[PDB]
Each structure stands twice: as structure tokens, then as C-alpha cells.
Amino acid sequence: ILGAILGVVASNVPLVEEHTRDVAHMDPHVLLQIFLPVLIFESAFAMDVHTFMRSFSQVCILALFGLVVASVLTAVLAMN
Amino acid sequence: FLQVAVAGPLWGYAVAKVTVFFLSHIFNDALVEITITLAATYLTYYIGDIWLEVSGVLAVVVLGLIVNAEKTSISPEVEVFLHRFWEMLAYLANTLIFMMVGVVVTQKALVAVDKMDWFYLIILYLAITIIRGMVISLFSPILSRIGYGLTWRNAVIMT
Amino acid sequence: APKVIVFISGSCLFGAISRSLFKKLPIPYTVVLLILGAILGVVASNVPLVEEHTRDVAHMDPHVLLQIFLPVLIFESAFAMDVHTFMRSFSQVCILALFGLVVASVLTAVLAMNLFNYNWNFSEAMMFGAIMSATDPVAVVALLKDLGASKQLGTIIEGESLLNDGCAIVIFNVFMKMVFFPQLTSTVGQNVLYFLQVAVAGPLWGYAVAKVTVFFLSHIFNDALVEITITLAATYLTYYIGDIWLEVSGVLAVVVLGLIVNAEKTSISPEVEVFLHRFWEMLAYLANTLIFMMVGVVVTQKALVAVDKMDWFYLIILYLAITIIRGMVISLFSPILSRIGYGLTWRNAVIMTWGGLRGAVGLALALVVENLAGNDVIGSKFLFHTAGIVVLTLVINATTIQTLLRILGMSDISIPKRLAMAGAVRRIHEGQNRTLNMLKSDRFLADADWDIATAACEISDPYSADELTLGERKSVCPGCKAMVPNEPSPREFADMMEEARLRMLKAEKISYWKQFEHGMLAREALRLLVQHAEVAADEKDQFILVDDLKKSWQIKGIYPWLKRKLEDLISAFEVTINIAIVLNIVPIIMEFQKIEDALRISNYVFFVIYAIEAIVKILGSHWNKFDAFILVVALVDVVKLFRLLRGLRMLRLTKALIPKLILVVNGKINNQLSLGYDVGKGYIIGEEEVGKIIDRMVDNKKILRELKHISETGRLQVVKELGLLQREHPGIAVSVKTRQAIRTILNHSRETIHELQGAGLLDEMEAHKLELTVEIKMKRLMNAPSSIPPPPPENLLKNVSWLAGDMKLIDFIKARASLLHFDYGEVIVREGDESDGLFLIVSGLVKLYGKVFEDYLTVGNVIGEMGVLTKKPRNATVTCETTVQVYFITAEDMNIAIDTFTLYPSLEYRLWRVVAIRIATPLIMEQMAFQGWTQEKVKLHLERGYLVDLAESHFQFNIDATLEDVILINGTAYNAHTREEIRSPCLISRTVHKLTFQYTATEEPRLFVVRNAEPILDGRLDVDSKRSLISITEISSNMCL
Amino acid sequence: RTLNMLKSDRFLADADWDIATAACEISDPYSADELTLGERKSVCPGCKAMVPNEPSPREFADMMEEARLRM
Amino acid sequence: NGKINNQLSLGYDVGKGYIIGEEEVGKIIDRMVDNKKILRELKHISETGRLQVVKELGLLQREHPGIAVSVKTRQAIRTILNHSRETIHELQGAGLLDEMEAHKLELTVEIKMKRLMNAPSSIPPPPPENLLKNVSWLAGDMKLIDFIKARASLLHFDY
Amino acid sequence: VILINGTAYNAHTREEIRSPCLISRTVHKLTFQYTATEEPRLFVVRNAEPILDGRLDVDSKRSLISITEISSNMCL
Ligand SMILES: Nc1ncnc2c1ncn2[C@@H]1O[C@@H]2COP(=O)(O)O[C@H]2[C@H]1O
């Protein structure tokens, strides 16, 4: 909500337009290469790995195959 | 497909073993261990995604799981520092992503939106919840016959 | 695809390799980082992919380099400082850093102009001197902290380095604006205004944002990441807004902000505090590694293409002249710097001269000069000379400063430190041998390879005229190792007196450390106490004097005068009119189109003339008299229209802002009085402990009597001084005593939480929840009212220990009390009068004097309890020192109250419990002194006990194994052996099987026992209305199957 | 116990103890079940219930289950 | 050998935890259990479980000798270093050692613990001559060690 | 106090210590007796016990200077 308020202020005011233009209109690859390693490494590092590996088969089959079939179903839903 | 789905985790495993071996032989300097962890994460993702043309996300997944598995190779003060440091780094990344997303949504994405698009958003939310529930319900006969089966309450909470 | 990630992560890997491989070598890792940067730069000059990466990173913008790397380095230099020792020598560090930096920059500019063949003018040479003068010693500070004493020299060096870096970047920015980026002319008044703006509004902006950051950090509970991001964003926003938006020196702002945040570390949670220390250290390490790698790459790519043998000769002469100039600066300011509280010797001057290590700050300034100069040769010469001076200073000064600290005699380990380390190593070796002998006979770990175990568990001694001094120190001790009877000599008596004084001072230091580690003392009070102890130990055969301790709680200064003046100044409607004041204020800022909407309709008709003057002050002082002056000036209601609002706003806001200044002054007096109270309590508890352990240490009776006499005179003087300090400022003393009481209760509750966690009775998550609760309570205690008003004398009767919960007894005692007012009467209690009632002190400080026991009791202490309970003539004469107000409950009323209220725990039982605790603390403290018990631990162990009801025992008592200590309070008792009934109150010897009390003339001798502390814990709940208040009632832990 | 110790201290004796007891007030975070607790309280006739008796086979089974739970 | 070392360390820790827990719960069972018949039954089943786990751990020692010797050496070094750290904290808290010197000794024992973390996981079993040298009732007396070693008799009982 | 193998008489000598067990803390004194040769061992653990004066000695090369006689039991 605060980002939306700052964005409409930047759409009105030119100095906030300068700041959010230089930052929010960023390159995609630099956005991935900066923000994805931090989030992915913290998600992997905050895990309790003993209880994760004790139920690794169930988590693996659920995440992998449920993600595949949910992506397929969402694609069919979007197309239809 | 073989290159991505195999050499992602293999590259992550290799750099994770190298990082664990490097962290095991460091004594009485915390900052070396913290910078080794940070540079190992960023170099793993960059070299995997760009130089080796492989899935760098699975490499960081495998590297983080192995480093969290071998927490005994890190000193305990460095261990609790690394926990709080990666927590605040993820907090920084989430805050920056949400602020940038709000700015670009109300600057660019909100100029082309109709009442049909809002209706599609509502039906998309309902169908996403229904699809996730159907996925968990269809995989529930498989997921029940493991060492930790799913009840209906756990399935509802996961949905 | 950003190559900056490759260069940053490669620089981190190279820094890790440099730190790991150069642990043992005396060469710093920054020099080999520069060498690796040069190798990477020539590889990039050959190979095009490394050229791509180092082109995208090392050829960076100057302003982004400053705005990224300078706040981190400056904030870590300010935050790693020990701010108490920095502010104790702030004048010397300030004059040395400021004036020595100015004169060294001037001398380096003159040297550059006269020596260098490049035709630099005075502004470019002053930029060169500003870059060269900035010193960043970290290895010197680490070596001075590691090598025992001269910690104050290390703090002087670190504070001078921080202020020198800040002022160097300030004068560098001034002369860089004079040379490169503008060339604009200005008048003398604009130059004066610019100098005033920079050198004043830098620290003022830093102070303002630091106060805002501290106020924001004080009100954050149970989220660390918010505090860490608040610190980081405050630092970066302070530097950016100061440097860019306000056009002010942002470096001094970050210096002031870091010093204030390091000063108020109590507003941060301790886990967040240690995280912030390690996090800012890591950030400064990252910034240093990146700066050194980038500097090496750009030096070997751009700065090394224009360099001659004359330039190398100029580099060598520049290094020699820089060292000579710094030595001349320290020598010329040595007469000024000697006459401070910490003067400089010649060895400290030599260490400070040779400790001028050039760091990453000057390298960053040379980088921004070289990028600002463009294709001109001045930036190349600047970068080459700065890199050469950095390399030479790092290598030569680091290695020869280790050698010079060895040579000058400042690195030798002191004899008591060597003794303590050797004793600790011997104790660790004995404990390891006992653990090894225990483990060799274990069930499981019995067939282990014990040669490898003894090789691995081999922690050794770190330390592996003096002979004559040790010979004297060994001939001064003819102790248990040498059983030769003799008689003392006057030279031998003087040596014994000196040795006894040294042992007393050493044991006082041990007591101060014991107070700190369990926690009664603060850090600064402990530092002051051990400083006074070592000062007394060093000089002139004197003990720790009362005057140097008295300098801590002398509250007088600017703050009590300000408090008195503001309290003389003073004597939701007000909130509403203050809201109206601010709502009028913001139109004045908007005023200073339709002529601004008719000047916002004449300021909303002067806000309907201040809401008809707040309905004429809701139909109503001298404050209101000048408010009526503002009223009639508003009745006059374009210079007058502009002036009236500005005169209205501050004059109306003065009444609001005065009590906030009162609260600020009360907070400053609260801090100073807290320090004074902590120093006084530490000295009193240390003197009590060292008096309880002085009979074992001191053998000669005359020296024992002299030491006991001087110790008890010092103790009585400090006790009387603290009582008068309580009498001086009542509300602030009540606030600091309330804060200390809440902190003590919360610390003991946290100890109970850790005890119940470690005993297994509570799991880890629930113990973590309770620890979160008590930590939130402690941090909310940190931000407390510092001027808590004193309780009424009626409320002091409610919160006594011998009547706390019995409301009917409270009503009876409060109804039949008598508040007397003695003024220097000294006729409270006489030596032999009959008992006529109690005396509950509600004000003032009494003085006890009787059999020779001397003490100064205060508010809360009851006088007359022994005489009233035992029906005997009183013990000691109690006098009045400052207008004591007692609560005289008469003897007949006390007898009626004892006979009346007995269905509860009886009033006689409560009074006997209070006097039993008071008479039983010094006996247990005398017996268990050598086992390592403090007075607070002894009192808390005594508080668990209960008086034995002798009706069931029928005057025959048996000592079981459950009872840990038995103390007879009032009278005699026989036993099974019945050798002699015990005449005096004392602790019962634990060998005695039974006690046989006798019926005599009516005393009924009370005995006090403390049973030792005692996993099923079955409890019963009950459901209530709304099905949310379901709670366990009958916790038993004593059930059947 | 800490409050009763601190009320009779040399220094911290005139503090405002109402504010101290208000601040040091760490409370309980948690503020068919009735029949289950009734069984769990009828299974414990312990030191708070001093009634001599003799065991029953249903009582013996309940005592065995309670002893196993306590172990 | 490292993987078997980790699994055998987990098994030894589980067995030692159960044995020490059964010893403690047998020492505190007289107060908790009032009926003598149930007390005797619980003591009997507790002692049978304790004896079975003790025999299983002895056979586990007999299975892999070098790996068991390595994990017992690691546990012994860790126990001695933990008690030395407790002695350091005791000497610090009693005031006899200042904060910087206690920090130096804590740094030394932490460096020793982290070097213990990277240890040979297949330490060979000591010879039977070396087991006579490191007993508790003859440790330092070299002449007594020589006398007992000269006049010993190594027997080879087989069931 | 734990008597390891044998008997001892009390100062009250109500009944001599029959079995190896924890000798009670209430007993003032023990009177071990000479009998058929066992010589009954009693095991005692004394409670643990700040001046700590020690003597060094300078050796060759003036680097191995170390304290030898840590005593903590001296006179003035
Ligand atoms: N050594 C002491 N310690 C604490 N309080 C004392 C001591 N001596 C006297 N008092 C107090 O001073 C009072 C003087 O008269 P009482 O003997 O009636 O009761 C006495 C106690 O309350």
C-alpha cells in the first residue's frame, strides 16, 4: 500500500519520479541475481534439516508433482 | 533438461562441499566465515546461472541445505550470527521487492485494467485455492502411506 | 548480467584467502590484497573478460564510491569505540586530532609544493595533505588491546583516528570543491557562512538524527531485524541527506551519530547489540576489502603508466617527511597534551608517531581525485603516491611497531597478571586431570585412545631489577610453606604492613569483579572502582580513599541548577490548544494562486481568533498575561501580519516545551545519580566482603586491627554520604531505587527461568517464551520515568515486610499509628530505657551507636523491634542525623495488635522472622565466607527459611539431614550431649544431633532453620465462562498412583 | 521471596514498591476435557487426600497406568 | 568411515541417553511410585531394558573397533574440554581471572573444540600393551608401569 | 564420609557401622577398630577452597620466565 502511494506520488511529483525511476525500473537480470540468492539461501538455511530429511520423500513428491500439475491446471485455466 | 535438472543440484553439491571444507579449517576469525558463506552463495548462483547455463536456484537450494546440515563446521557464535544475518538479509530483500512491486504496479500495471480483469482476478483466486485443494486431495492417497501421513486437518491447513 | 557480483564475491574470496594464509605472517592482509588487486589489474589489462569485469566495477563513479563506502567505515569506527574512555579523554583527543591534522596538512602541502616537480598550487597541495594526514590504525589498536596495559593509549589512538578521518574528509571536500568540481567565487560573508554551516551543522544534524534514532530504538520490542535495519537506514540516510540535501559535512554527522548510538547501547537489546557489533565489523571488513581491491586494480591500470625514478624518490622522501612531520606535530603539542588528566609520556608519543597507519579512507579519497581529474596527470600522481604511502606505512609501521612495542618495554606482562594466569592454568590442569581420571573409569568412554585425548586437551600457559623485586616479594611472605617461629622487626613490620595493604587492595578488586559478574555493579562503576583500587595500590602506602569515590556521587553542576530554575519557572484542554498551536504553526511555514487563497482566508480569520481565545481560556497567570499580550496583538489583526504568527508560535510553545526540558534534566541527573549509587554500593559490598575475609589473609593482630578500623571508617563515611545523597534529590533517588529493585527482581526471575529450564521441568520453547516476556519487561524498564515522586508516609506503612498482605492488620496499624517529627533530637532510643514502642522510619537517616556497632539506618528500617518483642531494655542508642520522621506505634498498641491478629501468620511470628533474618545474615556470612557467597545470596538463602513452631516440638528439637543451617535467635538451648546450653545467638554446629530448649523466664527461644530446596506435577483445571479462562488451580507435585 | 529480601535492604528500601510489583508481574501465557481431568484427578489420591484404603482391580489398573505415565 | 562415524555417534548418543535416563529414573522411582507390586514390575522392566541396551552397545563396540575408538576419543576430548570451559567460567565468575584473560583461554578451548570437530574418524584401536599404561590405578609411576608390564600375562579366553 | 569396607564405632557407640554405606553427617566422631586385618577405608570429600602469591625465575634467552611456586597460603 505504501509502495502504491509512493508510486502515485512519483507519477505526480518529478523528484520522487527521479528516485523511483532510477530504482523501481530496474533490469530484470540484476533483480533476479541480487534478490533470488538471498531469499532462496535463507529459505534453505532456516529449515530444520533433520525433520526435513526425515520427511524428504513426501515433501519432494508433493512439491515436484503438485507443482507440475498445478502449473498445468493454472495454464489451462488461464487459456480457457 | 538433463543439464538443468541434474547439474543444478550437482554444482550446488560441489560448491557446498568446497564451502564446508573451507569453513572447517578456519579458526578465530568470524568475518572470514561470514564472507565465505555470502560469497559462496552469490558465486554459486552467478556461475551456475550465467557461466554454466544451469539452474542456479536449485544449486543455492542444495548449498543451503548442505550448509544447514553441516552446522558443526561453523563456530556457534558465527552460527547464530549467520542465522540472524540471513534472516535480516531476507527481510531486506522482501521489503525491497514489495516496495518496488507496489511502485511499478501503480505506475505501469494499473493503466490497463478493466472490470472484466477484476472479475478474472477473483475467479483466479478461487480457482487457485480450489486447484491447490484438488492437488492435495489427489496426492493424499500417495502421501498417506509414508512415515508421516496427512490427515484431513493437515490437508486443509496446507491448502 | 551484473559483473559487480563477480568482482564483489571474488574480492570476498580473495580477502578470505588473504586472512587465512597470513595469520602467522606479520604482513597485514590488506597489503597482499593490494598485490592481488595489482595482479588482477594486469590480467585485466591483458585479458578482455577480466577487463569487462574490472571495467564495470573498478572504474566506478566517485560520488557513489563515497556514498557507499564512507558511511560504513565511519560508522564502524565510531561504533567500535569505547565511548566512556573516549569521552574521559575527549579534550586531548580533540585538540590533537583537530589542530595536529590542520598543521600536518599545512606542512604536507608546503612539502609537496617545495619538493614535488609538478607545479601544484596551494589548494591541490592542501588536498594532498588532507589525503595524507588521514590515518586508520586498526592493527595498532588491536596490538595495544592485546598487549596488557596502556589501554588508554589505544583509546587515545582510536579516538584521534576517528576524529582525524572525519576532519580529513571535511577539509578534503573543501579543497576538492576549491579545485575540481566548482570554481565559483564568493564573498567573505558567504565563506564565513559556509564554514559555519559545515563545521556546525554537520554535528548538529548528526545529533538530531542520533536522538531520533535512539528514541525510535527505545520503543521497539521483540523484533531484532527492525532494530538492525533502523541502524543501517539511519546511518545511510544521515550521510546522504547531510551530504546531498542539506549540503553539509555528512562525515561528521555519521561520527556524531555513531558516537551517540554507541553511548546509548542500553536502548538496544543485548543480542541485537552483539549482532550490531559483529555486523558493522563485517560491513567495515567488506568495505576495506572492496576498496583495497579496486585501488590495486586502478593503480596498476591507470596510475602506474606515468611514474618515474624521480617519482619513486619523491615517494621515499614523502614517507620520511610524513613520519618526521607527524613526530614534530606530536612533539610540539606535547606541552599542551601533558597538562590533561592523561598526559603523554615519550613512549606513548613514539607509539602514536609510529602508529600512523594510512588506511582505506585516504585510498578512497585518492580514487575520487583520480576519477575527478580525468586525463590530467594530477590524479595519477595522487593515486600513485597515496598507494605507495599506504603500502610503506602498512608494512614497515606494522612490523616495526610490533618490534617497537617489544623494544620500548610496553609489551611485558605484569607480575599480578602473570600470577593470575599461572594460577588459572594450574587450576585448569588440575580440573582436566580430575576429569580424565573420572572418564578413564567410565562405562562407555573407557577404551578411548587416551594419548590422543591428553595431547588434545593440553591447554597451556599463554605467557610460558625484576629478580631483586621478586626476591623482596618472596622474602615478604614467610607463610605456611616456611614454618619458622620468630618475632617481628620494625623493617619486617613495615614490610608486613605493605603486604597486608596490597592483599587488601587485591581482595577488594576480587570483590568488585565478583559484584560485576553476578551483577550488582554496572560496567562504568566497576571500572571506576578498580581504577581507584589500582591507584591506591600503586602510590604512597594509602588505602582507597573516600574522596575519589565521593567524586562520583557529587551531583552538583549545571543540571541541578537548571532543574531548580525550571521548577521555579513552573508552578485535554491544554493538549487541544497545543494541537491548535501546531495547526497554526504549519500555515506559517506555508506562508514563508489568488494571493495564496487570500492568505488562506486570513489564516482562517486567525483560526476564528484562536477559537475566540479558546473560549476565553474556557471562561477563565503571568503566562496568561503574555498570552493576553498575544491576544491584543491579534486584536490589532504586511510586516505586522507576518510577525504576529512568528511571535505567537514560540511564545505559546514555551509552556509546552519547558516540562520536556525538565524531564531531560531529570534524566541526566538520574544517570549521574545511578552511577554514584552504583559506585557507593559496590564499595560498601566490597568492604563488607573484604572485612569478612580479612581474618584469614592477615595474621598480625595490630595490622588486622588497623586495617579493620580504616575499613569501617571508610564504610561508615560512604554510607552516610549515600544517605545524604538520598536526602538531596528525593524523587530521582526513588526512581533509581525503583529501577534497581525491578532489575534485581527480573534478574532473579530470569535465573529461576534458567533453573527450571536446566532442571528439565520446562521445555525449550516455553522457557524461550518466558525469557522473551522478561526481556520485554527489562527493555520497558529501560525507558522509565526518571522522576518518580516519593511515596507518602502512609504508603510506607503499607509495604513493610512484617505486614504486607493482611489488610485488617494494615488498617489496625494505620488507624493506631503516630507520625512523629524529630529534628536532631538524638533521643529516639536510649541505652537502657524500657521498651515503649516501635519506630518505623519514613524519612531521614538515623545513626546507630551501641554495643562497638555503628550504622546509619534509613527509611523502611524498624527501630525498637528487639526491645518490644523481648520485653528487655534496649540495645543501642539511635540518634537523628537529618530530621527523622518516625512512625511511633506504642507498646500497648503493639501488644494489642499481637494478641488480636493471630489466625493468619501471626504478627509476633512476622516480627520474629524479620529480626531473625536481620540477626542471621552476618553469622551465615561469617561461616560461609570462604565458600564464595555474596551478601545477596546469603540473604536469599535465608529468605527461604521458616521459624520453628515449638508448640508441636514441645521444647525438644531434632536436627534432620534436610535442614541446612539452624540459627538460635533469642536465648539458650540444651542438647542430647548437654555439655552446656548455648549462651549467645549463633549458628548451631551441624554435628549436634538434637536441640533441647528449656522453659525459662518468658522468652520462648526462636530457632531459624532453612530446609534444602526440593517432577510429576499433577494439576487440576476448571472451565469457566466463555471457555477461555481455563487455568490450573491445584498444582500439587505430591500425589499417589 | 526476592521482593521480601529487597524490602529489608540497606539501599533499595525506600523504592516505590507498588510500581515494582506492577512491573514484575510476569503472568501465565495460557491464562470431554472435564471428564478426562476428573479421571486424571480421581487417579491421584495422594498427600492432599489422607484417606487409608485398599486397592481395587480397576483401581490397580488405573494405578498401573498412572505409574507408567509418571515413569 | 566418516559416514559410519556419524551414524555410530548418533547410535552411541541414543544408547548413552537411554542408559543414563533409566539409571536416574530408577533412582527416583521409590518416591514417585507408592505401590510395591507396581514398583517391582517397573523396576524389573527398567533393568531388563537397561541390560539389553548395555549389551547391544558392547556388541556395537565389538563390531567396528576403530570407528568406536574414534567416537569415544571424540566424546572424551569434548567432555574434558567442556569441563575445562566450566572451570574457566568458574574462575572468571569468582573474580580470580579478569575478562580479557578468560576470553583468551575461552578462545583457546574454542579453537581446540573446532579442531576436534575435524578429526580422524577411523582412529586405530590401541594395542593391549597401551591399555595397561593408561589405567587409573597406575598412570604416572613409570617404574610401576614397567614392573606390571614385565610381569603380566595376556590371556585369550574364548567363551 | 563413606566407609568403603569394614566397621567403625561411634563416639556415642550406640551400634557400630554394620555395612559399607554413607556415614551420616550427624555423627560427631568415628572410632575405627583394629581387628582381623582389613584396616577399613573411609572416603571423604572436602569442600573446595585470593592472594595467590607466586615466584618466577628467569631462564636462558629471557623469554621462558614462568611462575613455579603458586602457593595461595602466605604470611604478611
Ligand atoms: N547490630 C544491629 N543490627 C541491626 N539493627 C540493630 C543493631 N543494633 C541495634 N539495632 C536496632 O536498634 C534498636 C535499638 O533498640 P532495640 O534494641 O529495642 O532494637 C534495636 C534494633 O532495631
Residue ID of nearest Cα to ligand 1 atom 1: C853
Contacts of A46 in chain B (CB under 8 A): 68, 83, 86-87
CB contact under 8 A, C445 and E84: no
What pairs with residue C880 in β-bridges? C846
Residue stretches of the annotated binding site of C for 3',5'-cyclic AMP = 864, 866-867, 874-875
Distance between first and last Cα of chain E:
30
C432 touches chain E (CB under 8 A): yes
Task: Order across the sheet with C946-947: list the strands.
Answer: C946-947, C1007-1011, C963-968
Grid cell listed for C488: 617481628
* Deposited experimental method: cryo-EM
CA geometry: angle at C184 spanning C179 and C190, to 5°?
Answer: 110
Grid cell listed for C795: 504508603
Q: Look at residues C519, C434, C518, C520 and name the one whose alpha carbon lies nearest to residue E89.
A: C518
**Following DSSP, what letter does each residue of C107-120 receive, concatenated?**
HHHHHHHHH-SS--
Neighbours of chain E (3+ CB pairs under 8 A): B, C, D, F
Ligand 1 atom nearest C868 alpha carbon: 18
E33 touches chain D (CB under 8 A): yes
Query: Shortest CB distance from C1041 goes to which of D17, D24, D66?
Result: D66
In a 13 Å sphere around the CA of F29, the CA atoms on its Cβ side amount to 5
**Following DSSP, what letter does each residue of C224-248 receive, concatenated?**
HHHHHHHHHHHHHHHHHIIIIIS-S
Contacts of A34 in chain C (CB under 8 A): 2, 5
Verify whether ligand 1 is closer than 6 Å to residue C848 (CB atom): yes
Grid cell listed for C1027: 471457555
If you ran DSSP here, which 8-state letter would residue F48 be given?
A: P
Question: For residues B68 and B83, what is the distance between their CA atoms, to the nearest angstrom?
Answer: 10
Pick the residue from chain F with its C-alpha nearest to E96: F50
Question: For residues C362 and C1010, what is the distance between their CA atoms, to the nearest angstrom?
Answer: 68
**Gyration radius from chain E CA atoms:** 21
In total, the C-beta contacts within 8 angstroms joining chain B to chain E are: 14
Q: How would you label D22-59 residue by residue, b for 16+ Cβ within 10 Å and e otherwise?
A: ebbebeeeeeeeeeebeebbebbbbeeeeeeeeeeeeb
**Following DSSP, what letter does each residue of E4-72 receive, concatenated?**
HHHHHHHHHHHHHHHHHHHHHHHHTHHHH---HHHHHHHHHHHHHHHHHHHHHHHHHHHHSHHHHHHHH
Question: For residues B159 and B134, what is the distance between their CA atoms, to the nearest angstrom?
Answer: 9
Neighbours of chain C (3+ CB pairs under 8 A): A, B, D, E, F
Contacts of E118 in chain B (CB under 8 A): 24-25, 73
CB-based contacts of C594-599 (< 8 A; 24+ apart in sequence): C599/C641
**Following DSSP, what letter does each residue of A16-41 receive, concatenated?**
HHHHHHHHHS--HHHHHHHHHHHHHH
Q: What is the 3-state secondary structure of C500-558?
A: HHHHHHHHHHHHHHHHHHHCCCCHHHHHHHHHHHHHHHHCCCCCCCHHHHHCCCCCCCH
Question: For residues C795 and C787, what is the distance between their CA atoms, to the nearest angstrom?
Answer: 18
> Which positions ≥6 away from F18 have C-beta within 8 Å?
F7
In total, the C-beta contacts within 8 angstroms joining chain A to chain B are: 142
Contacts of B25 in chain E (CB under 8 A): 118
Rounded to the nearest angstrom, the distance between the alpha carbon of C849 and the centre of ligand 1 is 9
Question: For residues C66 and C108, what is the distance between their CA atoms, to the nearest angstrom?
Answer: 24
Question: For residues C115 and C109, what is the distance between their CA atoms, to the nearest angstrom?
Answer: 10
Question: For residues C517 and C509, what is the distance between their CA atoms, to the nearest angstrom?
Answer: 12
Grid cell listed for C295: 585501488
* C788 to chain B, closest Cα gap in Å: 38
* E111 to chain B, closest Cα gap in Å: 6
In the three-class reduction of DSSP (H, G, I as helix; E, B as strand; rest coil), residue B146 is classed as: coil
Grid cell listed for D51: 484417606
Rounded to the nearest angstrom, the distance between the alpha carbon of C852 and the centre of ligand 1 is 12
CB contact under 8 A, F71 and C481: yes
* C937 to chain D, closest Cα gap in Å: 10
Question: For residues C812 and C798, what is the distance between their CA atoms, to the nearest angstrom?
Answer: 11
Residue type, C437: N
Question: Is beta strand C1031-1032 parallel, antiparallel or unpaired with respect to C853-855?
Answer: unpaired
Grid cell listed for C881: 542525623
Distance from chain centroid for Cα C588: 44
Whether the CB-CB separation of B43 and B14 falls below 8 Å is answered with no
Question: For residues C721 and C436, what is the distance between their CA atoms, to the nearest angstrom?
Answer: 53
Backbone angles phi, psi at F57, to 5 degrees: -155, 130
Mutational pocket test of ligand 1: of C866, C919, C939, the residue with most ligand atoms within 8 Å of the beta carbon: C866
Could you tell me the CA-to-CA distances from C159 to B136, C53, C132, C277 in Å, in that order? 63, 38, 18, 17
Question: For residues B106 and B120, what is the distance between their CA atoms, to the nearest angstrom?
Answer: 19
Question: For residues C72 and C60, what is the distance between their CA atoms, to the nearest angstrom?
Answer: 18
Contacts of E96 in chain F (CB under 8 A): 50, 52
Helix and strand totals (H; E) in chain C: 40, 13
Question: For residues C564 and C558, what is the distance between their CA atoms, to the nearest angstrom?
Answer: 10
CB contact under 8 A, C440 and E135: yes
If you ran DSSP here, which 8-state letter would residue C989 be given?
A: P
Question: For residues F4 and C570, what is the distance between their CA atoms, to the nearest angstrom?
Answer: 81
What pairs with residue C358 in β-bridges? C135
Q: Look at residues E3, B27, E120, E57 and name the one whose alpha carbon lies nearest to residue C452.
A: E120
Question: Is beta strand F56-57 parallel, antiparallel or unpaired with respect to F8-10?
Answer: unpaired
Verify whether ligand 1 is closer than 6 Å to residue C917 (CB atom): no
Grid cell listed for C244: 546531498
Whether the CB-CB separation of C920 and C969 falls below 8 Å is answered with yes
Whether the CB-CB separation of C885 and C858 falls below 8 Å is answered with no
Could you tell me the CA-to-CA distances from E14 to B147, C336, E8, E19 in Å, in that order? 20, 70, 10, 9
Question: For residues B72 and B76, what is the distance between their CA atoms, to the nearest angstrom?
Answer: 8
In the three-class reduction of DSSP (H, G, I as helix; E, B as strand; rest coil), residue C968 is classed as: strand
What pairs with residue C967 in β-bridges? C987, C1008
CB contact under 8 A, E115 and B27: yes
Rounded to the nearest angstrom, the distance between the alpha carbon of C855 and the centre of ligand 1 is 10
Chain breaks in chain A (C to N over 2.5 A) after: none
Interface of C with B in 206-225 (CB under 8 A): 224-225
Question: For residues C205 and C255, what is the distance between their CA atoms, to the nearest angstrom?
Answer: 11
Q: Look at residues C959, C960, C967, C973 and name the one whose alpha carbon lies nearest to residue C942.
A: C967
Residue ID of nearest Cα to ligand 1 atom 12: C863
Residue type, C517: E
> In this structure, is the dihedral angle defined by the CA atoms of residues C307, C308, C312 and C313, taken in order, positive or negative?
negative
Best mutation target, C406, C412, C461, C470, to test chain F (most F CBs within 10 A): C470
Verify whether ligand 1 is closer than 6 Å to residue C243 (CB atom): no
Q: Look at residues C346, C177, C162 and name the one whose alpha carbon lies nearest to residue C256.
A: C162
Q: At what angle do helices E65-93 and E2-27 cross, to 10 degrees?
A: 60
In total, the C-beta contacts within 8 angstroms joining chain D to chain E are: 21
Residue labelled with grid coordinates 495564496? C596
A71 touches chain B (CB under 8 A): no
Using a threshold of 3 CB pairs under 8 A, tell whether chains F and C touch. Answer: yes
Grid cell listed for A54: 526425515
Residue stretches of the annotated binding site of C = 864-867, 874-875
Mutational pocket test of ligand 1: of C719, C829, C845, the residue with most ligand atoms within 8 Å of the beta carbon: C829
Question: For residues C97 and C366, what is the distance between their CA atoms, to the nearest angstrom?
Answer: 21
Interface of C with D in 886-915 (CB under 8 A): 914
Question: For residues E132 and C440, what is the distance between their CA atoms, to the nearest angstrom?
Answer: 12
Question: For residues C734 and C740, what is the distance between their CA atoms, to the nearest angstrom?
Answer: 10
Q: What kind and span of H or E run contains C811?
A: helix C807-815
Q: Look at residues C705, C691, C713, C695 and name the one whose alpha carbon lies nearest to residue C497.
A: C705
Contacts of B75 in chain E (CB under 8 A): 110, 114
Whether the CB-CB separation of E97 and F52 falls below 8 Å is answered with no
Verify whether ligand 1 is closer than 6 Å to residue C918 (CB atom): yes
Could you tell me the CA-to-CA distances from C165 to C130, C361, C604, C951 in Å, in that order? 9, 7, 52, 79
CB contact under 8 A, C1018 and D40: yes
Distance from chain centroid for Cα C499: 33
Burial label for C571, CB within 10 Å (0-12, 13-18, 19+), is exposed
B38 touches chain C (CB under 8 A): yes
Ligand 1 atom nearest C877 alpha carbon: 14
If you ran DSSP here, which 8-state letter would residue F16 be given?
A: -
Chain breaks in chain D (C to N over 2.5 A) after: 31
